[PDB]
Design a protein around this ligand. Structure first.
Ligand SMILES: CC(C)[C@@H](Nc1ncnc2[nH]ccc12)C(=O)O
Length: 164
């Protein structure tokens, strides 16, 4: 039910929107979370998605970490999408503010290729500290499945489109 997106490539689309509000409207098969390795959903996309689930995402995530241990930077896991989507794909992009290797951003986006269509944010951008223009270029050059990108900041959205 995706609507109002700008086509960037054969398989990549973009919209100025809060990913939480997009997930409530569309109820997609997969929503991507910008996770950390511990699945501690405090702020940014992860804190906003978790709050919209009334903390059910964090309770499920804590059980997953208690059983499996932490994810790898560049890795992912599939958990419930609760009231927002059928599934949530928690993907860990490198956090530049912590010295993590930006080359791991391509490995993070490769997780998207396991799903035919996804609603997603720009990985490693926002509070993770990487350049969003770089993140969109890695997304375009790595993901082959259909990805609908939601960018919250209007000013950044306009810059991403103009410089594409
Ligand atoms: C990742 C980053 C580039 C982006 N953040 C987001 N993008 C989309 N929905 C969101 N909900 C909460 C945060 C958020 C932004 O600052 O525009």
């Amino acid at each position: 039910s995706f609507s109002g997106y700008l086509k960037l490539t054969d398989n990549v689309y973009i919209k100025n929107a809060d990913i939480v509000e997009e997930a409530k409207k569309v109820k997609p098969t997969v929503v991507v979370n910008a996770a950390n390795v511990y699945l501690k959903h405090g702020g940014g996309v992860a804190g906003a998605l978790n709050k919209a689930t009334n903390n059910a995402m964090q309770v499920e995530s804590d059980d997953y970490i208690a059983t499996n241990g932490p994810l790898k930077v560049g890795g992912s896991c599939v958990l419930s999408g609760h009231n927002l989507a059928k599934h949530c794909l928690h993907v860990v992009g490198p956090n530049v503010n912590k010295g993590e290797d930006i080359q791991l951003l391509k490995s993070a986006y490769e997780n998207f290729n396991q799903h035919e269509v996804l609603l997603a944010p720009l990985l490693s951008a926002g509070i993770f500290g990487a350049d969003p223009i770089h993140s969109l270029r890695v997304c375009v050059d790595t993901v082959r499945t259909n990805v609908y990108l939601a960018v919250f900041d209007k000013n950044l959205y306009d810059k991403l489109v103009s410089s594409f």
